[PDB]
């Protein structure tokens, strides 16, 4: 019973904390990268015209 509970806690830590934290961070990075690359090409086109 003790081993069951210790196994359960590790499962729930992964399920409700570790994995979602990784999911949310991946989403964030992915978005931020995307934004900066659009801003970068926008500026390049401006510098192009200069």
């Amino acid at each position: 019973a003790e081993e069951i509970e210790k196994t359960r806690r590790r499962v729930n830590a992964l399920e409700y904390m570790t994995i979602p934290q990784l999911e949310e961070t991946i989403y964030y990075i992915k978005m931020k990268l995307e934004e900066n690359e659009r801003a970068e090409v926008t500026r390049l086109i401006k510098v192009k015209n200069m």
Binding site: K6, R10, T18, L44, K48, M50
Partner: protein, 563 residues
């Protein structure tokens, strides 16, 4: 003859018309103040000028004069142990002349003391056929470093007159009969900093440098003629690492370039270096050091100059047959000077605003490092080992400076903030770091010590710990077998007892090749014997404190382990 006139000022960039007599890269005196600058562009008669000093107060209608010569360094006796700025102006003479503790504008001081008397000892016979690089004599610039007076490039003929004596570096000490007539030679030669000083042959750098820093010399070694980059976040111990290499490396001369960094660090070097005495010699490390300083609040354009000034001086000493180490700290500030100028020229920037030629510039610098056969009948062997700090923002090594650097250097010492925070020093990431000299140095060490396998095995343990920890972080240390627990303990030992090294400890500050061998042997021995868990661990303090042993007290541990 011709006098230019300023028609635009915008920060460090100044445009002058009526400069049609001048050529690209000519040095110039700008404005009423005559601040020092360099022509970078020419459109019709209008020159674009990059000023190496502050341009506040300067504006249209002021005169501009070219000097007709590119940015150059004076190379001769009186260069060792001084401190210069980015364009080789003596900072101490600067202080005496202006009678000021501050750096003001428009003063042109010669690099070296042209009035100081030296004893020139002639070593070559009259009637000898000579060419570039040939030694005609020497001066004892320090008790150990012989300053060899070479036939400058572009001189070729027969030695007609020469003799020992007391001279200044302006006095004629030799006459050579050349096809261009009789030409008189002094102890001094000038050289453009953006041109590599020519050699006969480039060679493979296959002799490992002894740095005495365990992690480097063992796992990520550098050879004489090698190039290593040290990218790290701020507060990673950026400085101490470079100081350690400068003070413990077995090179003949050290050229230290403070590029766009803190002034207090330059002050520290000139205070500490003279106090570091080689016991086998009796003279200090300052007596084998040259310092170039262009601080973070000094003029931007001069950062580039400090880099080239430094490498050219190192090549000069290389040509004498000496092994030289050049410290560039930091290359990132140089790259930002390229970026600011690129922005001001409204060039199309590459990644992060850095110019599209960034990769190429860095390549041109590091290709000047290396092991060579110098010009001259002797065919003397010499080398330049480059140690460069890189400062990627946030420690993101994907940034263009680090990335372009790693395509042309051969050794990567990645400093790590995580290691630094838990006070693991030097904070070198052993998984991220690498040396393309590992293989060759391994061969050399195996032969000298009668090692390759142990380094491979040490790295393999470290790599295994890393893969195990990928799981333990996202699962826990719960279900680990005895084998895996042993692996983690061996790796712990490598990390804490070997990798970690205090530069401020009297003993730990340097570790010899043999002491290094005995320490790694002991660590691996415990692992091997234990492998052959709670039982074994409760029955290693001697190993932890091996680093503090002044050799038989280390080697004897192997027998205590096994018993």
């Amino acid at each position: 003859m011709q006098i230019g006139k300023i028609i635009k000022v915008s920060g460090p960039l100044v445009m002058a018309e009526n400069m049609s007599e001048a050529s690209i890269q000519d040095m110039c005196l700008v404005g009423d103040l005559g601040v020092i600058g360099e022509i970078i562009e020419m459109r019709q008669d209008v020159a674009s000028i990059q000023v190496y000093e502050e341009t506040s107060g300067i504006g249209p209608g002021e005169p501009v004069r070219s000097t007709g010569e590119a940015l150059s360094v004076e190379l001769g006796p009186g260069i060792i142990s001084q401190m210069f700025d980015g364009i080789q102006r003596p900072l101490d003479t600067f202080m005496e002349v202006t009678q000021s503790n501050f750096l003001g504008r428009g003063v042109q001081l010669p690099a070296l003391d042209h009035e100081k008397q030296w004893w020139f000892e002639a070593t070559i016979e009259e009637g000898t056929e000579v060419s570039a690089g040939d030694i005609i004599g020497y001066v004892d610039e320090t008790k150990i470093i012989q300053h060899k007076i070479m036939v400058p490039n572009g001189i070729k003929g027969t030695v007609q007159k020469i003799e020992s004596g007391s001279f200044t570096i302006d006095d004629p000490i030799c006459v050579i009969e050349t096809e261009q007539g009789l030409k008189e030679l002094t102890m001094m030669q000038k050289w453009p900093v953006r041109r590599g000083r020519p050699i006969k042959q480039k060679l493979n750098p296959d002799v490992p440098m002894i740095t005495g820093q365990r992690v480097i010399d063992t796992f990520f070694p550098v050879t004489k003629g090698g190039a290593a980059a040290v990218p790290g976040p701020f507060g990673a111990g950026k400085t101490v690492v470079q100081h350690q290499i400068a003070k413990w490396s077995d090179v003949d001369l050290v050229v230290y370039v403070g590029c766009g960094e803190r002034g207090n660090e330059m002050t520290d070097v000139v205070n500490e270096f003279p106090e570091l005495i080689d016991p086998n010699t009796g003279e200090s490390l300052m007596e084998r050091t040259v310092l170039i300083a262009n601080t973070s609040n000094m003029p931007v354009a001069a950062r580039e100059a400090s880099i080239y000034t430094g490498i050219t001086i190192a090549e000069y000493f290389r040509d004498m047959g000496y092994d030289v180490a050049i410290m560039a700290d930091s290359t990132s500030r140089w790259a930002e000077a390229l970026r600011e100028m690129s922005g001001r020229l409204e060039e199309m920037p590459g990644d992060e605003g850095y110019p599209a030629y960034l990769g190429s510039r860095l390549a041109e610098y590091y290709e000047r490092s290396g092991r060579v056969i110098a010009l001259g009948s002797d065919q003397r062997e010499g080398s330049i080992t480059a140690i460069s700090a890189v400062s990627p923002s946030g420690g993101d090594i994907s940034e263009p400076v680090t990335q372009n650097t790693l395509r042309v250097v051969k050794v990567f010492w990645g400093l790590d903030s995580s290691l630094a925070q838990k006070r693991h020093f030097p904070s070198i990431n052993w998984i991220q770091s690498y040396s393309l000299y590992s293989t060759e140095v391994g061969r050399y060490m195996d032969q000298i010590l009668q090692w390759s396998d142990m380094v491979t095995e040490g790295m393999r343990i470290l790599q295994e710990e890393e893969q195990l920890n990928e799981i333990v972080r996202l699962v826990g240390i719960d279900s680990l077998s005895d084998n895996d627990r042993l692996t983690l303990e061996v790796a712990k030992s490598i990390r804490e007892d070997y990798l970690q090294q205090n530069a401020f400890d009297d003993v730990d500050t340097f570790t010899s090749r043999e002491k290094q061998f005995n320490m790694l042997k002991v660590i691996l021995t415990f692992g091997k014997e234990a492998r052959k868990f709670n039982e074994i661990m409760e029955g290693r303090e001697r190993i932890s404190r091996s680093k503090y042993i002044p050799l038989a007290k280390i080697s004897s541990i192997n027998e205590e382990i096994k018993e």
